[PDB]
PDB file of C-alpha atoms in Angstrom:
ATOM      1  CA  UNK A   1       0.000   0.000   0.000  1.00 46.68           C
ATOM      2  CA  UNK A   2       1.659   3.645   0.529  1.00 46.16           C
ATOM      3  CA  UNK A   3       4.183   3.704   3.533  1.00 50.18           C
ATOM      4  CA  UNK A   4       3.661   6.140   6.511  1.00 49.69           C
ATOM      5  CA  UNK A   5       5.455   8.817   4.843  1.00 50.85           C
ATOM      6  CA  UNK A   6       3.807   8.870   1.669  1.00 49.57           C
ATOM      7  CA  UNK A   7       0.637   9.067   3.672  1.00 47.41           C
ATOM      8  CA  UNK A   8       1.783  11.718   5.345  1.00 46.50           C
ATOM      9  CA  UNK A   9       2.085  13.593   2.002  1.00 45.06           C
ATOM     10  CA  UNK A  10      -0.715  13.025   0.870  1.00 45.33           C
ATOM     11  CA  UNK A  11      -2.681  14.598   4.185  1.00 46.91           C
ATOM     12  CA  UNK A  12      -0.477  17.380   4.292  1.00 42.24           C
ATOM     13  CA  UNK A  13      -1.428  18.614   0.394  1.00 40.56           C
ATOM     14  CA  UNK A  14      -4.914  17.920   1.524  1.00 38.69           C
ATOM     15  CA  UNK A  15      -4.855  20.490   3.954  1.00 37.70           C
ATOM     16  CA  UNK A  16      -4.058  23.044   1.751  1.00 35.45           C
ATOM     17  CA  UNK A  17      -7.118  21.819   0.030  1.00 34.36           C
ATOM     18  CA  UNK A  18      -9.011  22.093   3.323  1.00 38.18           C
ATOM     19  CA  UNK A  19      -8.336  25.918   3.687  1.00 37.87           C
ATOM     20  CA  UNK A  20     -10.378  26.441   0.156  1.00 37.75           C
ATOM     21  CA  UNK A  21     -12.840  23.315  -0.278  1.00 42.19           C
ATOM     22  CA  UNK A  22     -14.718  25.389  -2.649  1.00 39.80           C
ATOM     23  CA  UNK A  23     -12.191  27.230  -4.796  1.00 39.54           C
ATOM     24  CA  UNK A  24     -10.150  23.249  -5.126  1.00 41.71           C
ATOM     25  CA  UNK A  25     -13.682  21.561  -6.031  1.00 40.48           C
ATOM     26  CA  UNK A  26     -14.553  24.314  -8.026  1.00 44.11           C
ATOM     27  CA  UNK A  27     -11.277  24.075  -9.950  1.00 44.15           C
ATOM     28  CA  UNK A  28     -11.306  20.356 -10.041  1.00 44.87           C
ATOM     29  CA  UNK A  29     -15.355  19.981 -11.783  1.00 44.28           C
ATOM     30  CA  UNK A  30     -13.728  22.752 -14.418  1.00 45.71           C
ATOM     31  CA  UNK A  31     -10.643  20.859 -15.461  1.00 45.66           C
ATOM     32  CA  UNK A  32     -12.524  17.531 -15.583  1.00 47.86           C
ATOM     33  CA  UNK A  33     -15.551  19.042 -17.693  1.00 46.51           C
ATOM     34  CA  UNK A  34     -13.319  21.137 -20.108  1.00 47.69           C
ATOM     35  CA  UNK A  35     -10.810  18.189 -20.552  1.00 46.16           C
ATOM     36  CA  UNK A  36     -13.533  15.259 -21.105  1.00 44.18           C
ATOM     37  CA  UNK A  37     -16.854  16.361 -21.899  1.00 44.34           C
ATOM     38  CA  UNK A  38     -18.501  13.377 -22.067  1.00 42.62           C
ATOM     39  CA  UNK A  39     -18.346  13.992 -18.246  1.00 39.58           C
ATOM     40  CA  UNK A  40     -20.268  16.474 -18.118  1.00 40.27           C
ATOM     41  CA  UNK A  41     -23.407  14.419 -19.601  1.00 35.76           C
ATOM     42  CA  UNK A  42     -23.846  12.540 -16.191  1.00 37.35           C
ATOM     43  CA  UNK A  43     -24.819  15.711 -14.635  1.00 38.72           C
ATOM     44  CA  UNK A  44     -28.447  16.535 -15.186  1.00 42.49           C
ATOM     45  CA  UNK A  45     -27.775  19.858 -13.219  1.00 42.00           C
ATOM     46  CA  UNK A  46     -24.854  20.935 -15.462  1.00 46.72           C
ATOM     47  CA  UNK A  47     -24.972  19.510 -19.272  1.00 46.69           C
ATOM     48  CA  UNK A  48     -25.832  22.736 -20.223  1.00 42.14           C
ATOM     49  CA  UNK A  49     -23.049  24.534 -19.467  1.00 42.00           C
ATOM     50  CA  UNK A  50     -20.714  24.865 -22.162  1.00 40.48           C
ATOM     51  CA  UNK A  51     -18.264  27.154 -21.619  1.00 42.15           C
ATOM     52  CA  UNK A  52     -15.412  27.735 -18.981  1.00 38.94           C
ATOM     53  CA  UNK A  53     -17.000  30.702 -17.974  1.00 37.89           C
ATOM     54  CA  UNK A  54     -20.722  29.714 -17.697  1.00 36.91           C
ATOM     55  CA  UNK A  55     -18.658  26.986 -15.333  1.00 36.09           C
ATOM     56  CA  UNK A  56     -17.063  29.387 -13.447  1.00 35.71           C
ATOM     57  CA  UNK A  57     -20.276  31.161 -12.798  1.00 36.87           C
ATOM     58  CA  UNK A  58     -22.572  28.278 -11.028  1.00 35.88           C
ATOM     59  CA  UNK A  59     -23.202  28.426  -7.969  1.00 32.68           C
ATOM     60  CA  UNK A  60     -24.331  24.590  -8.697  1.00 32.85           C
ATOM     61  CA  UNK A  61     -21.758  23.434  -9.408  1.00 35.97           C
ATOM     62  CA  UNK A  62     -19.214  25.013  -7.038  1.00 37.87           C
ATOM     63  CA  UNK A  63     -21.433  23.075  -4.285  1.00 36.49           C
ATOM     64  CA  UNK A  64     -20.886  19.458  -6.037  1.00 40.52           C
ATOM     65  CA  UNK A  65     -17.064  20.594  -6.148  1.00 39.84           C
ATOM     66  CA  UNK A  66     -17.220  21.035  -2.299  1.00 36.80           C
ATOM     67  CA  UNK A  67     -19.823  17.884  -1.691  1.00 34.95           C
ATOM     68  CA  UNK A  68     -17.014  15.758  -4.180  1.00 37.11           C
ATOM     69  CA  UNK A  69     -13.977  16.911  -2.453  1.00 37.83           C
ATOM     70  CA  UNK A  70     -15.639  16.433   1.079  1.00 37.29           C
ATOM     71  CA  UNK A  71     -16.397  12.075   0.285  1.00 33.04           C
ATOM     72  CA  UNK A  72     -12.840  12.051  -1.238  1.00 32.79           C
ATOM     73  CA  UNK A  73     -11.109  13.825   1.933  1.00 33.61           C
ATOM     74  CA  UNK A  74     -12.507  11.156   4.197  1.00 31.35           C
ATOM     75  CA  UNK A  75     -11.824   8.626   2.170  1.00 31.32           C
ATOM     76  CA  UNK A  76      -7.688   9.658   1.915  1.00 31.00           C
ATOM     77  CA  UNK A  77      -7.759  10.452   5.847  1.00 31.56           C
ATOM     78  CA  UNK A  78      -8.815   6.895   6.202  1.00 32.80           C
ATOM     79  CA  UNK A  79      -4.736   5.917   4.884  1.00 31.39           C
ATOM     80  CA  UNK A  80      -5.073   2.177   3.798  1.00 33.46           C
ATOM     81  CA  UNK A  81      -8.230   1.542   5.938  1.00 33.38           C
ATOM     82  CA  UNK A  82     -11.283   3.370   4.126  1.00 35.81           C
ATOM     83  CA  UNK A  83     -13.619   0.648   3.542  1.00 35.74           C
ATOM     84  CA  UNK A  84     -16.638   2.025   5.493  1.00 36.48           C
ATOM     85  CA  UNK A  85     -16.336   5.541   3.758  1.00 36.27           C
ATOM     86  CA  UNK A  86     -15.624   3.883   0.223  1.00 38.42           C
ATOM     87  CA  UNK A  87     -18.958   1.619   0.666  1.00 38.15           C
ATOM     88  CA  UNK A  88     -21.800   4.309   0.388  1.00 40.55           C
ATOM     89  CA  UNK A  89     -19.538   6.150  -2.359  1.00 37.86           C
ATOM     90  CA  UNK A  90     -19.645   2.618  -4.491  1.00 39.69           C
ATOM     91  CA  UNK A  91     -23.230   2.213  -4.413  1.00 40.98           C
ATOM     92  CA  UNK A  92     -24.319   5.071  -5.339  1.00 38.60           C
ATOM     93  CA  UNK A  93     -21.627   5.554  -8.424  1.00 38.04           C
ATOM     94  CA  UNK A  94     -22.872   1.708  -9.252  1.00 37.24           C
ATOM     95  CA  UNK A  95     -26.160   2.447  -8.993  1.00 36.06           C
ATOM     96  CA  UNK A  96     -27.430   5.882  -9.261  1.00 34.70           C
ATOM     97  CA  UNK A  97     -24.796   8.119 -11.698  1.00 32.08           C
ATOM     98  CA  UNK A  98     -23.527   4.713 -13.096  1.00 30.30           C
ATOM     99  CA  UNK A  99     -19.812   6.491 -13.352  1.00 32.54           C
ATOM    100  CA  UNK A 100     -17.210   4.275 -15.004  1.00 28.93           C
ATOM    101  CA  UNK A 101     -13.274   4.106 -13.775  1.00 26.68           C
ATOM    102  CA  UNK A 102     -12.344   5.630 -16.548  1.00 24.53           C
ATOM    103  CA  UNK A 103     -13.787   9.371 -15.250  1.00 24.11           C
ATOM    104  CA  UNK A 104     -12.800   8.004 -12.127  1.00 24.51           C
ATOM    105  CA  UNK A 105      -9.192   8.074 -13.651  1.00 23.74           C
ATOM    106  CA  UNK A 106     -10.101  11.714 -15.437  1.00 23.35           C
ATOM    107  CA  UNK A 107     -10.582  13.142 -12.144  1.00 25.17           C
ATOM    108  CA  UNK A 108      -7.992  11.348 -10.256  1.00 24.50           C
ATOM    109  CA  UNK A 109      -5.841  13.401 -13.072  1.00 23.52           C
ATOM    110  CA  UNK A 110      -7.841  16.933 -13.055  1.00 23.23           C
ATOM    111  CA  UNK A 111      -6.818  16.343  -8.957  1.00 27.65           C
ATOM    112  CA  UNK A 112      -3.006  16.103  -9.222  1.00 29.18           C
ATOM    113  CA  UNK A 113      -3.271  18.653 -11.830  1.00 24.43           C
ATOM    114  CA  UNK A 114      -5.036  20.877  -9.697  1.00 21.47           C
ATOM    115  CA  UNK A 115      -2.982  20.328  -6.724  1.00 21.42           C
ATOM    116  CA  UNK A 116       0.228  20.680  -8.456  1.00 21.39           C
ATOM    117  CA  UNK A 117      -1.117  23.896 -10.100  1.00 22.22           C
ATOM    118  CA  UNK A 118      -1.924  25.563  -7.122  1.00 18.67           C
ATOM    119  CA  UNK A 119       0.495  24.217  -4.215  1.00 24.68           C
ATOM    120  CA  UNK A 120       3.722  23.314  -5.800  1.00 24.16           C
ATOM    121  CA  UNK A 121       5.692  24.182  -2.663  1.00 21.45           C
ATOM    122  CA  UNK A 122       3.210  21.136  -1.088  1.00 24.87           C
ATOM    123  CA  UNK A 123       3.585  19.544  -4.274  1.00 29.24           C
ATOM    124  CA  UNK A 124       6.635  18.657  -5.501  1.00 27.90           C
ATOM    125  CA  UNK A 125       7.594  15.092  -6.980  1.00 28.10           C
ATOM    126  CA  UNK A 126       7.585  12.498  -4.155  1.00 31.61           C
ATOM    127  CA  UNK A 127       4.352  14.145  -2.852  1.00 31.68           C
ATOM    128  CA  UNK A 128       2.725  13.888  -6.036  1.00 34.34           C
ATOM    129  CA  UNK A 129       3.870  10.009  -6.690  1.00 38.77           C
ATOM    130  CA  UNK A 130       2.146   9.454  -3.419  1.00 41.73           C
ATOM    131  CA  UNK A 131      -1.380  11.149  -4.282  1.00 42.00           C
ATOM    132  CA  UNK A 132      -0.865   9.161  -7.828  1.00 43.29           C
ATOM    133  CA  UNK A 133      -0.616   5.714  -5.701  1.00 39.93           C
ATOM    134  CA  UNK A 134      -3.857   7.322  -3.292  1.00 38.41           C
ATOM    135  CA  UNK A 135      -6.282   7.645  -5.891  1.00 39.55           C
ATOM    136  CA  UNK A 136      -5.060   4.888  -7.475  1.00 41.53           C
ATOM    137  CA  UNK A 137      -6.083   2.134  -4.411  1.00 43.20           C
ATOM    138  CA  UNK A 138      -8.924   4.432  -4.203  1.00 43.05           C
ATOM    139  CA  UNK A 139      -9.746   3.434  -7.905  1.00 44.63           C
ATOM    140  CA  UNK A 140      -9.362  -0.206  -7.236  1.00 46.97           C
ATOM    141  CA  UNK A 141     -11.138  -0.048  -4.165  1.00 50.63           C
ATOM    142  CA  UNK A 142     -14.192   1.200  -5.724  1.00 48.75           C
ATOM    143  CA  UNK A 143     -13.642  -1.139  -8.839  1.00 49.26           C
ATOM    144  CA  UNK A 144     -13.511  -4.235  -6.799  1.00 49.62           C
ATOM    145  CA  UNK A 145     -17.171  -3.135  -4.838  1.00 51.19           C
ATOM    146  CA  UNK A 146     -18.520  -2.003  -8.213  1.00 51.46           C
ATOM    147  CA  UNK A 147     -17.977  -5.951  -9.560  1.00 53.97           C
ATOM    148  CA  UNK A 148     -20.014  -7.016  -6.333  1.00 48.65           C
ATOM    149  CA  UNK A 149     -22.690  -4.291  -6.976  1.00 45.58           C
ATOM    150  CA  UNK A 150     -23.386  -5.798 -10.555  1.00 43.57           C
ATOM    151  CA  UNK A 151     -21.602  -3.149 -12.436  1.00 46.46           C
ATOM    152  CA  UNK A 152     -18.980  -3.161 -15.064  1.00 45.34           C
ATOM    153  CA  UNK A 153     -17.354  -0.307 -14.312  1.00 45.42           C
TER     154      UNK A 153
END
């Protein structure tokens, strides 16, 4: 899994995220949308947007940035051991939104990018190898409950 330290890299860029949950989900929903639109057609609340700026501008959608980044900070603060916050988070992406890995991927991406955009002092190569390696048991976490849940992700 990640060793202590590489943990501990990974919670100390997500406190920097903690001082601005809104601006860093905000950010996050933009990068995803404008880099793989077909993302955007999951969210009956935001298809329409098209632009950047009509982004930028929803109060909507700066909300879902918060309510995404929120599941996915409990989940990391829970280090190796994040089964009972993954669970609910599976069966509703398996079920409800029906959201494959591969967006889980693009946003595990739009993430580091986002991080390493805005907090390159907290950022720098070792910390962002251990985010990469985060998201990614975080990926195969949810993969393995989305098999269970009847889903091909």
């Amino acid at each position: 899994g990640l060793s202590d330290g590489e943990w501990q890299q990974v919670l100390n860029v997500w406190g920097k995220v903690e001082a601005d949950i809104a601006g860093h989900g905000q950010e996050v929903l933009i990068r995803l949308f404008t880099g793989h639109p077909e993302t955007l057609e999951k969210f009956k609340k935001f298809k329409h947007l098209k632009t950047e700026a009509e982004m930028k501008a929803s109060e909507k959608l700066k909300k879902h940035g918060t309510v995404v980044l929120t599941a996915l900070g409990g989940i990391l603060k829970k280090k190796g051991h994040h089964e009972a916050e993954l669970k609910p988070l599976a069966q509703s992406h398996a079920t409800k939104h029906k959201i494959p890995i591969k967006y889980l991927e693009f946003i595990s991406d739009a993430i580091i990018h986002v991080l390493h955009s805005k907090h390159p002092g907290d950022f720098g190569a070792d910390a962002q190898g251990a985010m990469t390696k985060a998201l990614e048991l975080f990926r195969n976490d949810i993969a393995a409950k989305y098999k269970e849940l009847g889903f091909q992700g």
